[PDB]
From a paper:
P. falciparum nucleoside transporter 1 (PfENT1, encoded by PF3D7_1347200), located predominantly in the parasite plasma membrane (PPM), is the primary nucleoside transporter mediating nucleoside uptake from erythrocytes. Crucially, PfENT1, a member of equilibrative nucleoside transporters (ENT, SLC29) family, shares only 17% sequence identity with the human equilibrative nucleoside transporter ENT1 (hENT1) and is unsusceptible to hENT1 inhibitors, which provides an opportunity to design inhibitors targeting PfENT1 specifically. The overall structure of PfENT1 contains eleven transmembrane (TM) helixes with pseudosymmetry. Here, we report three cryo-EM structures of PfENT1 in the apo, inosine-bound, and inhibitor-bound states at a resolution of 3.3 Å, 3.1 Å, and 4 Å, respectively.
To decipher the substrate recognition mechanism, we determined the structure of the PfENT1Y190A-Nb48 complex in the presence of inosine. Comparing the density of PfENTY190A-Nb19, the omitted density indicative of one inosine molecule was clearly visible in the central cavity of the PfENT1Y190A-Nb48 structure. The base and ribose moieties of inosine point to the N and C domains, respectively, which is similar with the adenosine analog-NBMPR binding site of hENT137 37. Notably, the ketone group of inosine, which also exists in guanosine, forms a hydrogen bond with the amino group of Gln135 on TM4 of PfENT1. Additionally, the rotamer of Gln135 is stabilized by interacting with Ser49, which is critical for inosine binding. The ribose moiety of inosine forms direct contact with Trp53, Asp287, and Arg291. Furthermore, the hydrophobic residues Leu50, Trp53, and Leu73 limit the rotation of inosine. In particular, the resolution of the transmembrane domain of PfENT1Y190A-Nb48 reaches approximately 2.6 Å. In addition, several hydrophobic residues, including Phe283 and Leu393, are involved in nucleoside recognition. Interestingly, none of the residues of Nb48 have direct polar interaction with inosine, except for the potential hydrophobic interaction between Try104 and the ribose group of inosine. The two structures of PfENT1 present identical inward open conformations with r.m.s.d. value at 0.398 Å.
Author numbering:
A (entry chain A): 30 to 214, 228 to 413
B (entry chain C): 1 to 122
Write the structure that this text describes.
Amino acid sequence: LSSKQHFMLSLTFILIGLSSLNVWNTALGLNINFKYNTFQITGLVCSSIVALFVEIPKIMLPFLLGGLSILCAGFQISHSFFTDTQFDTYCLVAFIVIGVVAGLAQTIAFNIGSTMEDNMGGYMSAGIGISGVFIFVINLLLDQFVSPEKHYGVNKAKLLALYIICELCLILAIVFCVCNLDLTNATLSYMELFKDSYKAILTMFLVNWLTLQLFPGVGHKKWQESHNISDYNVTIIVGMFQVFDFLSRYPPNLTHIKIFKNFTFSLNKLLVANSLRLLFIPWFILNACVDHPFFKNIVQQCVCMAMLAFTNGWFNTVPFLVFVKELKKAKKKKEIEIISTFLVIAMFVGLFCGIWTTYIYNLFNIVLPKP
Amino acid sequence: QVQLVESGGGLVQPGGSLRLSCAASGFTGSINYMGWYRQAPGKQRELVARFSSGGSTNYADSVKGRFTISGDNAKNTVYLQMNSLKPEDTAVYYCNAETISYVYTVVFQDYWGQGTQVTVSS
Ligand SMILES: O=c1[nH]cnc2c1ncn2[C@@H]1O[C@H](CO)[C@@H](O)[C@H]1O
Protein backbone atom coordinates (compact mmCIF):
# COMPACT_ATOMS: atom_id res chain seq x y z
CA LEU A 1 0.00 0.00 0.00
CA SER A 2 2.09 2.88 -1.33
CA SER A 3 1.18 6.58 -1.33
CA LYS A 4 -0.84 6.46 -4.56
CA GLN A 5 -3.07 3.59 -3.43
CA HIS A 6 -3.49 5.12 0.03
CA PHE A 7 -4.54 8.45 -1.48
CA MET A 8 -6.94 6.73 -3.88
CA LEU A 9 -8.55 4.69 -1.10
CA SER A 10 -8.89 7.68 1.24
CA LEU A 11 -10.48 9.69 -1.57
CA THR A 12 -12.81 6.77 -2.28
CA PHE A 13 -13.99 6.63 1.33
CA ILE A 14 -14.47 10.41 1.41
CA LEU A 15 -16.58 10.14 -1.74
CA ILE A 16 -18.58 7.26 -0.25
CA GLY A 17 -19.51 9.35 2.77
CA LEU A 18 -20.22 12.49 0.75
CA SER A 19 -22.45 10.70 -1.76
CA SER A 20 -24.27 8.81 0.99
CA LEU A 21 -25.13 11.96 2.95
CA ASN A 22 -25.80 14.26 -0.02
CA VAL A 23 -29.39 12.98 -0.26
CA TRP A 24 -30.19 13.80 3.37
CA ASN A 25 -28.40 17.14 3.11
CA THR A 26 -30.32 18.16 -0.02
CA ALA A 27 -33.60 16.99 1.52
CA LEU A 28 -32.86 19.33 4.43
CA GLY A 29 -31.74 22.17 2.17
CA LEU A 30 -34.76 22.10 -0.15
CA ASN A 31 -37.17 22.64 2.78
CA ILE A 32 -38.77 19.31 1.87
CA ASN A 33 -41.96 18.50 3.77
CA PHE A 34 -41.30 17.32 7.31
CA LYS A 35 -42.97 13.91 6.99
CA TYR A 36 -40.53 12.98 4.22
CA ASN A 37 -37.58 13.75 6.52
CA THR A 38 -39.27 11.71 9.25
CA PHE A 39 -39.70 8.76 6.88
CA GLN A 40 -36.07 9.00 5.74
CA ILE A 41 -34.79 9.04 9.33
CA THR A 42 -37.04 6.10 10.25
CA GLY A 43 -35.79 4.03 7.32
CA LEU A 44 -32.18 4.97 8.02
CA VAL A 45 -32.26 4.01 11.69
CA CYS A 46 -34.18 0.79 11.04
CA SER A 47 -31.78 -0.32 8.30
CA SER A 48 -28.69 0.59 10.32
CA ILE A 49 -29.85 -1.22 13.46
CA VAL A 50 -30.83 -4.29 11.43
CA ALA A 51 -27.52 -4.30 9.51
CA LEU A 52 -25.47 -4.05 12.71
CA PHE A 53 -26.41 -7.64 13.60
CA VAL A 54 -26.45 -9.02 10.02
CA GLU A 55 -23.31 -9.28 7.88
CA ILE A 56 -24.76 -8.23 4.53
CA PRO A 57 -22.38 -8.86 1.59
CA LYS A 58 -20.05 -6.03 0.61
CA ILE A 59 -20.63 -6.59 -3.13
CA MET A 60 -24.00 -4.81 -2.81
CA LEU A 61 -22.49 -1.36 -2.17
CA PRO A 62 -22.36 -0.27 -5.85
CA PHE A 63 -25.89 -1.63 -6.30
CA LEU A 64 -27.16 0.36 -3.31
CA LEU A 65 -25.49 3.51 -4.61
CA GLY A 66 -27.01 2.97 -8.06
CA GLY A 67 -30.39 2.54 -6.41
CA LEU A 68 -29.92 5.88 -4.67
CA SER A 69 -28.99 7.49 -8.00
CA ILE A 70 -32.05 6.14 -9.80
CA LEU A 71 -34.19 7.26 -6.84
CA CYS A 72 -32.84 10.80 -7.26
CA ALA A 73 -33.64 10.59 -10.97
CA GLY A 74 -37.13 9.51 -9.97
CA PHE A 75 -37.40 12.55 -7.71
CA GLN A 76 -36.60 14.75 -10.69
CA ILE A 77 -39.00 12.94 -13.03
CA SER A 78 -41.86 12.97 -10.51
CA HIS A 79 -41.39 16.66 -9.75
CA SER A 80 -41.31 17.54 -13.45
CA PHE A 81 -44.10 15.37 -14.88
CA PHE A 82 -46.38 14.21 -12.04
CA THR A 83 -49.43 15.64 -10.27
CA ASP A 84 -49.72 16.48 -6.57
CA THR A 85 -50.84 13.13 -5.14
CA GLN A 86 -48.51 11.10 -7.36
CA PHE A 87 -45.55 13.27 -6.36
CA ASP A 88 -46.43 12.97 -2.67
CA THR A 89 -46.80 9.18 -2.83
CA TYR A 90 -43.55 8.76 -4.73
CA CYS A 91 -41.78 11.11 -2.32
CA LEU A 92 -42.84 9.17 0.76
CA VAL A 93 -42.02 5.73 -0.65
CA ALA A 94 -38.75 6.90 -2.21
CA PHE A 95 -37.62 8.60 0.99
CA ILE A 96 -38.31 5.44 3.00
CA VAL A 97 -36.32 3.31 0.57
CA ILE A 98 -33.57 5.96 0.37
CA GLY A 99 -33.20 5.88 4.14
CA VAL A 100 -32.97 2.09 4.09
CA VAL A 101 -30.48 2.00 1.20
CA ALA A 102 -28.29 4.76 2.67
CA GLY A 103 -28.17 2.97 6.02
CA LEU A 104 -27.17 -0.30 4.36
CA ALA A 105 -24.50 1.42 2.24
CA GLN A 106 -23.05 3.22 5.26
CA THR A 107 -22.95 -0.04 7.21
CA ILE A 108 -21.14 -1.78 4.34
CA ALA A 109 -18.61 1.05 4.08
CA PHE A 110 -18.05 1.05 7.85
CA ASN A 111 -17.44 -2.70 7.83
CA ILE A 112 -15.04 -2.45 4.89
CA GLY A 113 -13.07 0.42 6.40
CA SER A 114 -12.87 -0.98 9.93
CA THR A 115 -11.58 -4.41 8.88
CA MET A 116 -8.25 -3.01 7.68
CA GLU A 117 -4.97 -1.71 8.98
CA ASP A 118 -4.81 2.12 9.16
CA ASN A 119 -8.58 2.21 9.57
CA MET A 120 -10.30 4.53 7.10
CA GLY A 121 -13.37 5.57 9.11
CA GLY A 122 -12.03 9.06 9.72
CA TYR A 123 -11.94 9.68 5.97
CA MET A 124 -15.60 8.70 5.66
CA SER A 125 -16.43 11.02 8.56
CA ALA A 126 -14.62 13.82 6.75
CA GLY A 127 -16.60 12.93 3.64
CA ILE A 128 -19.88 13.24 5.55
CA GLY A 129 -18.93 16.65 6.88
CA ILE A 130 -17.73 17.81 3.47
CA SER A 131 -21.07 16.65 2.07
CA GLY A 132 -22.87 18.87 4.55
CA VAL A 133 -20.78 21.98 3.94
CA PHE A 134 -20.74 21.36 0.16
CA ILE A 135 -24.53 21.16 0.00
CA PHE A 136 -24.66 24.38 2.06
CA VAL A 137 -22.34 26.19 -0.36
CA ILE A 138 -24.20 24.85 -3.39
CA ASN A 139 -27.49 26.08 -1.92
CA LEU A 140 -26.09 29.58 -1.41
CA LEU A 141 -24.64 29.71 -4.93
CA LEU A 142 -27.95 28.48 -6.37
CA ASP A 143 -30.10 30.99 -4.47
CA GLN A 144 -28.47 33.85 -6.39
CA PHE A 145 -29.14 32.58 -9.93
CA VAL A 146 -32.32 30.49 -9.52
CA SER A 147 -35.92 31.73 -9.65
CA PRO A 148 -38.23 30.73 -6.73
CA GLU A 149 -40.97 28.92 -8.63
CA LYS A 150 -42.02 26.57 -5.77
CA HIS A 151 -44.01 24.07 -7.82
CA TYR A 152 -45.14 21.88 -4.90
CA GLY A 153 -43.65 23.93 -2.09
CA VAL A 154 -40.18 23.04 -3.42
CA ASN A 155 -38.14 25.14 -5.83
CA LYS A 156 -38.08 23.64 -9.32
CA ALA A 157 -34.67 24.58 -10.74
CA LYS A 158 -33.04 24.39 -7.32
CA LEU A 159 -34.31 20.83 -6.87
CA LEU A 160 -33.14 19.88 -10.36
CA ALA A 161 -29.65 21.30 -9.78
CA LEU A 162 -29.27 19.77 -6.32
CA TYR A 163 -30.33 16.32 -7.48
CA ILE A 164 -28.20 16.34 -10.65
CA ILE A 165 -25.27 17.26 -8.40
CA CYS A 166 -26.16 14.40 -6.05
CA GLU A 167 -26.38 11.95 -8.95
CA LEU A 168 -23.07 13.13 -10.41
CA CYS A 169 -21.16 12.85 -7.14
CA LEU A 170 -22.78 9.48 -6.44
CA ILE A 171 -21.83 8.06 -9.85
CA LEU A 172 -18.27 9.28 -9.31
CA ALA A 173 -18.32 7.53 -5.92
CA ILE A 174 -19.56 4.37 -7.66
CA VAL A 175 -16.66 4.52 -10.11
CA PHE A 176 -14.18 4.94 -7.26
CA CYS A 177 -15.79 2.09 -5.30
CA VAL A 178 -15.52 -0.29 -8.25
CA CYS A 179 -11.95 0.73 -9.09
CA ASN A 180 -10.42 0.73 -5.61
CA LEU A 181 -12.15 -1.60 -3.13
CA ASP A 182 -12.00 -5.40 -3.19
CA LEU A 183 -15.60 -6.57 -2.69
CA THR A 184 -15.12 -10.26 -3.54
CA ASN A 185 -14.85 -11.76 -0.04
CA ALA A 186 -14.67 -15.88 28.11
CA THR A 187 -16.76 -12.75 27.58
CA LEU A 188 -19.08 -10.88 29.94
CA SER A 189 -22.81 -11.20 29.28
CA TYR A 190 -24.58 -8.41 27.40
CA MET A 191 -26.42 -7.39 30.57
CA GLU A 192 -23.10 -7.08 32.42
CA LEU A 193 -21.70 -4.82 29.69
CA PHE A 194 -24.88 -2.73 29.69
CA LYS A 195 -24.74 -2.23 33.46
CA ASP A 196 -21.17 -0.91 33.24
CA SER A 197 -21.67 1.60 30.43
CA TYR A 198 -25.25 2.66 31.02
CA LYS A 199 -24.33 6.34 31.34
CA ALA A 200 -22.54 6.37 27.98
CA ILE A 201 -25.55 4.77 26.29
CA LEU A 202 -27.89 7.20 28.06
CA THR A 203 -25.84 10.27 27.13
CA MET A 204 -25.71 9.21 23.47
CA PHE A 205 -29.50 8.87 23.38
CA LEU A 206 -30.16 12.19 25.12
CA VAL A 207 -28.08 14.36 22.78
CA ASN A 208 -29.62 12.95 19.59
CA TRP A 209 -33.15 12.79 21.02
CA LEU A 210 -33.19 16.51 21.83
CA THR A 211 -31.53 17.78 18.65
CA LEU A 212 -33.91 15.89 16.34
CA GLN A 213 -36.86 17.13 18.38
CA LEU A 214 -36.01 20.66 17.32
CA PHE A 215 -33.83 21.15 14.23
CA PRO A 216 -35.81 19.75 11.26
CA GLY A 217 -39.18 20.46 12.88
CA VAL A 218 -39.57 23.27 15.41
CA GLY A 219 -36.06 24.33 14.36
CA HIS A 220 -36.53 26.04 11.01
CA LYS A 221 -40.00 24.87 9.91
CA LYS A 222 -42.06 26.53 12.66
CA TRP A 223 -40.11 29.79 12.69
CA GLN A 224 -40.64 30.10 8.94
CA GLU A 225 -44.31 29.12 9.22
CA SER A 226 -44.85 31.71 11.96
CA HIS A 227 -42.64 34.65 10.94
CA ASN A 228 -42.82 34.06 7.15
CA ILE A 229 -39.06 33.66 6.93
CA SER A 230 -37.79 34.20 3.40
CA ASP A 231 -36.66 31.16 1.44
CA TYR A 232 -33.22 32.75 1.08
CA ASN A 233 -32.84 33.02 4.86
CA VAL A 234 -33.96 29.42 5.44
CA THR A 235 -30.91 28.00 3.65
CA ILE A 236 -28.69 30.12 5.90
CA ILE A 237 -30.51 28.93 9.03
CA VAL A 238 -30.34 25.29 7.91
CA GLY A 239 -26.74 25.83 6.84
CA MET A 240 -25.68 27.04 10.29
CA PHE A 241 -26.61 23.57 11.52
CA GLN A 242 -24.81 21.50 8.88
CA VAL A 243 -21.66 23.63 9.02
CA PHE A 244 -21.39 23.73 12.81
CA ASP A 245 -22.41 20.09 13.33
CA PHE A 246 -19.34 18.94 11.40
CA LEU A 247 -16.90 21.50 12.82
CA SER A 248 -17.82 20.57 16.41
CA ARG A 249 -16.90 16.88 16.05
CA TYR A 250 -13.20 17.67 15.65
CA PRO A 251 -12.18 19.67 18.79
CA PRO A 252 -13.11 16.78 21.13
CA ASN A 253 -10.86 14.45 19.14
CA LEU A 254 -7.90 16.86 19.16
CA THR A 255 -7.33 16.78 22.92
CA HIS A 256 -3.54 16.69 22.50
CA ILE A 257 -3.79 20.43 21.76
CA LYS A 258 -3.69 22.71 24.80
CA ILE A 259 -6.74 24.63 23.55
CA PHE A 260 -9.02 21.57 23.33
CA LYS A 261 -7.82 19.98 26.58
CA ASN A 262 -11.20 20.32 28.33
CA PHE A 263 -13.43 19.30 25.41
CA THR A 264 -13.52 15.69 26.65
CA PHE A 265 -14.38 16.03 30.33
CA SER A 266 -16.56 13.25 31.83
CA LEU A 267 -19.76 11.17 31.80
CA ASN A 268 -21.32 12.48 35.02
CA LYS A 269 -20.72 16.04 33.83
CA LEU A 270 -22.03 15.04 30.40
CA LEU A 271 -25.35 14.00 31.95
CA VAL A 272 -25.81 17.43 33.52
CA ALA A 273 -24.52 19.03 30.31
CA ASN A 274 -27.31 17.34 28.36
CA SER A 275 -29.75 18.71 30.94
CA LEU A 276 -28.63 22.25 30.13
CA ARG A 277 -29.41 21.37 26.51
CA LEU A 278 -33.04 21.09 27.63
CA LEU A 279 -33.00 24.89 27.90
CA PHE A 280 -32.90 24.91 24.09
CA ILE A 281 -36.55 23.82 24.05
CA PRO A 282 -37.84 27.11 25.56
CA TRP A 283 -35.49 29.02 23.25
CA PHE A 284 -36.76 27.33 20.08
CA ILE A 285 -40.40 27.76 21.09
CA LEU A 286 -39.90 31.47 21.84
CA ASN A 287 -38.53 31.99 18.32
CA ALA A 288 -41.89 30.78 16.99
CA CYS A 289 -44.39 32.37 19.41
CA VAL A 290 -42.97 35.85 20.16
CA ASP A 291 -43.30 38.85 17.87
CA HIS A 292 -40.92 41.65 18.91
CA PRO A 293 -37.95 42.26 16.59
CA PHE A 294 -35.37 40.40 18.71
CA PHE A 295 -36.87 37.01 17.85
CA LYS A 296 -37.79 38.12 14.32
CA ASN A 297 -34.08 38.44 13.55
CA ILE A 298 -31.99 36.39 11.14
CA VAL A 299 -28.83 36.95 13.18
CA GLN A 300 -30.02 35.42 16.45
CA GLN A 301 -31.91 32.61 14.72
CA CYS A 302 -28.64 31.65 13.04
CA VAL A 303 -26.94 31.79 16.45
CA CYS A 304 -29.84 29.88 18.04
CA MET A 305 -29.16 27.00 15.61
CA ALA A 306 -25.36 27.27 15.54
CA MET A 307 -25.34 26.70 19.30
CA LEU A 308 -27.67 23.71 18.96
CA ALA A 309 -25.53 22.27 16.16
CA PHE A 310 -22.24 22.86 17.99
CA THR A 311 -23.42 21.14 21.17
CA ASN A 312 -24.99 18.32 19.14
CA GLY A 313 -21.74 17.37 17.44
CA TRP A 314 -19.63 18.05 20.53
CA PHE A 315 -21.75 15.84 22.79
CA ASN A 316 -22.02 13.00 20.26
CA THR A 317 -18.27 12.30 20.23
CA VAL A 318 -17.58 12.85 23.94
CA PRO A 319 -19.19 9.61 25.26
CA PHE A 320 -17.12 7.55 22.82
CA LEU A 321 -13.85 9.12 23.99
CA VAL A 322 -14.44 8.69 27.74
CA PHE A 323 -16.60 5.57 28.18
CA VAL A 324 -13.54 3.33 28.52
CA LYS A 325 -12.22 5.54 31.34
CA GLU A 326 -15.15 5.00 33.73
CA LEU A 327 -16.01 1.33 33.12
CA LYS A 328 -14.65 -1.13 35.69
CA LYS A 329 -14.98 -4.81 34.75
CA ALA A 330 -14.73 -4.67 30.93
CA LYS A 331 -11.14 -5.50 29.99
CA LYS A 332 -11.08 -7.55 26.78
CA LYS A 333 -10.85 -6.17 23.25
CA LYS A 334 -14.08 -7.81 22.07
CA GLU A 335 -16.09 -6.42 24.99
CA ILE A 336 -15.20 -2.80 24.20
CA GLU A 337 -16.11 -3.38 20.55
CA ILE A 338 -19.46 -4.75 21.76
CA ILE A 339 -19.96 -1.73 24.04
CA SER A 340 -19.17 0.65 21.18
CA THR A 341 -21.92 -1.13 19.24
CA PHE A 342 -24.32 -0.33 22.09
CA LEU A 343 -23.42 3.36 21.81
CA VAL A 344 -24.10 3.59 18.07
CA ILE A 345 -27.45 1.89 18.69
CA ALA A 346 -28.26 4.62 21.22
CA MET A 347 -27.45 7.15 18.49
CA PHE A 348 -29.87 5.62 15.99
CA VAL A 349 -32.54 5.09 18.64
CA GLY A 350 -31.99 8.72 19.61
CA LEU A 351 -32.50 9.87 16.03
CA PHE A 352 -35.70 7.83 15.67
CA CYS A 353 -37.20 8.92 18.99
CA GLY A 354 -36.13 12.52 18.44
CA ILE A 355 -37.61 12.89 14.96
CA TRP A 356 -40.99 11.45 16.01
CA THR A 357 -41.14 13.60 19.16
CA THR A 358 -41.47 16.76 17.04
CA TYR A 359 -45.16 15.86 16.62
CA ILE A 360 -45.65 16.51 20.34
CA TYR A 361 -45.28 20.24 19.65
CA ASN A 362 -48.19 20.15 17.18
CA LEU A 363 -50.61 20.02 20.13
CA PHE A 364 -49.49 23.42 21.44
CA ASN A 365 -50.58 26.58 19.63
CA ILE A 366 -46.98 27.58 19.01
CA VAL A 367 -47.06 29.27 15.60
CA LEU A 368 -48.50 32.76 15.25
CA PRO A 369 -51.89 33.21 13.58
CA LYS A 370 -51.70 34.20 9.93
CA PRO A 371 -53.29 37.67 10.47
CA GLN B 1 1.65 11.02 12.14
CA VAL B 2 1.67 9.14 15.45
CA GLN B 3 5.01 8.40 17.12
CA LEU B 4 5.61 5.89 19.91
CA VAL B 5 8.94 6.47 21.66
CA GLU B 6 10.45 3.84 23.95
CA SER B 7 13.44 3.60 26.28
CA GLY B 8 14.84 0.92 28.55
CA GLY B 9 16.36 -1.85 26.46
CA GLY B 10 19.64 -3.40 27.47
CA LEU B 11 21.45 -6.39 28.95
CA VAL B 12 20.95 -7.27 32.62
CA GLN B 13 22.45 -9.92 34.86
CA PRO B 14 19.96 -12.55 36.09
CA GLY B 15 17.94 -11.38 39.07
CA GLY B 16 18.19 -7.73 38.03
CA SER B 17 15.56 -5.22 37.01
CA LEU B 18 14.72 -2.74 34.26
CA ARG B 19 12.37 0.16 33.57
CA LEU B 20 10.66 0.52 30.19
CA SER B 21 9.21 3.94 29.37
CA CYS B 22 6.90 4.60 26.42
CA ALA B 23 5.34 7.86 25.20
CA ALA B 24 2.74 8.65 22.53
CA SER B 25 2.81 11.88 20.52
CA GLY B 26 0.11 12.01 17.84
CA PHE B 27 -2.69 9.65 18.97
CA THR B 28 -5.37 11.41 16.92
CA GLY B 29 -8.51 10.96 18.99
CA SER B 30 -8.63 9.42 22.45
CA ILE B 31 -6.33 6.68 23.77
CA ASN B 32 -7.90 3.61 25.35
CA TYR B 33 -4.98 1.37 26.31
CA MET B 34 -1.19 1.28 26.36
CA GLY B 35 0.62 -2.02 26.73
CA TRP B 36 3.81 -3.99 26.17
CA TYR B 37 4.01 -7.04 23.89
CA ARG B 38 7.21 -9.06 24.05
CA GLN B 39 8.44 -11.18 21.15
CA ALA B 40 11.06 -13.81 21.89
CA PRO B 41 13.68 -14.73 19.25
CA GLY B 42 11.82 -16.90 16.76
CA LYS B 43 8.41 -16.69 18.46
CA GLN B 44 5.20 -14.69 18.21
CA ARG B 45 4.28 -11.51 20.05
CA GLU B 46 2.67 -12.04 23.45
CA LEU B 47 1.05 -9.61 25.86
CA VAL B 48 3.05 -8.71 28.97
CA ALA B 49 1.15 -5.83 30.58
CA ARG B 50 -1.60 -3.37 29.67
CA PHE B 51 -2.83 -0.17 31.29
CA SER B 52 -6.17 1.47 30.55
CA SER B 53 -6.99 5.16 30.53
CA GLY B 54 -8.93 4.67 33.76
CA GLY B 55 -6.22 2.59 35.41
CA SER B 56 -7.21 -1.04 34.93
CA THR B 57 -4.16 -3.29 34.62
CA ASN B 58 -3.91 -6.51 32.62
CA TYR B 59 -1.00 -8.90 33.07
CA ALA B 60 0.36 -12.11 31.60
CA ASP B 61 0.62 -14.94 34.12
CA SER B 62 4.21 -15.61 33.02
CA VAL B 63 5.27 -12.27 34.53
CA LYS B 64 2.57 -12.20 37.22
CA GLY B 65 3.90 -10.75 40.47
CA ARG B 66 7.15 -9.56 38.86
CA PHE B 67 6.42 -6.74 36.40
CA THR B 68 4.48 -3.68 37.54
CA ILE B 69 2.90 -1.29 35.04
CA SER B 70 2.31 2.38 35.88
CA GLY B 71 0.52 4.93 33.73
CA ASP B 72 0.04 8.61 33.01
CA ASN B 73 -2.76 10.41 31.20
CA ALA B 74 -1.69 14.05 30.90
CA LYS B 75 1.48 12.91 29.12
CA ASN B 76 0.14 9.51 27.96
CA THR B 77 3.35 7.86 29.15
CA VAL B 78 3.42 4.27 30.41
CA TYR B 79 6.20 2.84 32.58
CA LEU B 80 6.96 -0.81 33.30
CA GLN B 81 9.18 -1.69 36.25
CA MET B 82 10.31 -5.25 35.58
CA ASN B 83 11.80 -7.17 38.50
CA SER B 84 13.28 -10.53 39.49
CA LEU B 85 14.57 -11.12 35.98
CA LYS B 86 15.51 -14.59 34.73
CA PRO B 87 17.01 -15.63 31.37
CA GLU B 88 13.69 -16.66 29.80
CA ASP B 89 12.52 -13.01 29.64
CA THR B 90 14.92 -12.02 26.84
CA ALA B 91 12.92 -10.64 23.91
CA VAL B 92 12.09 -7.47 22.00
CA TYR B 93 9.40 -5.38 23.69
CA TYR B 94 6.87 -3.52 21.54
CA CYS B 95 4.85 -0.60 22.88
CA ASN B 96 1.23 -0.73 21.72
CA ALA B 97 -1.37 2.04 21.95
CA GLU B 98 -5.06 1.38 21.29
CA THR B 99 -7.15 4.47 20.55
CA ILE B 100 -10.59 5.62 19.36
CA SER B 101 -11.77 8.69 17.43
CA TYR B 102 -15.49 8.64 16.40
CA VAL B 103 -15.73 11.85 14.42
CA TYR B 104 -18.79 10.42 12.66
CA THR B 105 -18.16 6.67 13.07
CA VAL B 106 -16.30 4.63 15.68
CA VAL B 107 -12.75 3.62 14.73
CA PHE B 108 -10.28 1.53 16.73
CA GLN B 109 -6.63 2.00 15.80
CA ASP B 110 -3.50 0.36 17.21
CA TYR B 111 -0.05 1.95 16.96
CA TRP B 112 3.03 -0.20 17.54
CA GLY B 113 6.42 1.08 18.63
CA GLN B 114 9.78 0.10 17.21
CA GLY B 115 10.65 -2.16 20.14
CA THR B 116 13.54 -2.35 22.59
CA GLN B 117 15.82 -5.37 22.93
CA VAL B 118 15.99 -6.79 26.46
CA THR B 119 18.55 -9.51 27.19
CA VAL B 120 19.27 -11.46 30.38
CA SER B 121 22.46 -13.54 30.37
CA SER B 122 26.00 -13.85 31.75
O1 LIG C 1 -27.01 8.91 7.09
C1 LIG C 1 -26.61 9.37 8.14
N1 LIG C 1 -25.43 8.91 8.87
C2 LIG C 1 -24.99 9.47 10.11
N2 LIG C 1 -25.76 10.55 10.68
C3 LIG C 1 -26.98 11.05 9.96
C4 LIG C 1 -27.39 10.51 8.78
N3 LIG C 1 -28.47 11.14 8.40
C5 LIG C 1 -28.75 12.08 9.34
N4 LIG C 1 -27.82 12.01 10.29
C6 LIG C 1 -27.65 12.77 11.46
O2 LIG C 1 -28.80 13.89 11.53
C7 LIG C 1 -28.31 14.86 12.26
C8 LIG C 1 -28.74 16.21 11.66
O3 LIG C 1 -28.06 16.42 10.46
C9 LIG C 1 -26.75 14.73 12.17
O4 LIG C 1 -26.23 14.51 13.41
C10 LIG C 1 -26.51 13.49 11.35
O5 LIG C 1 -25.40 12.75 11.96
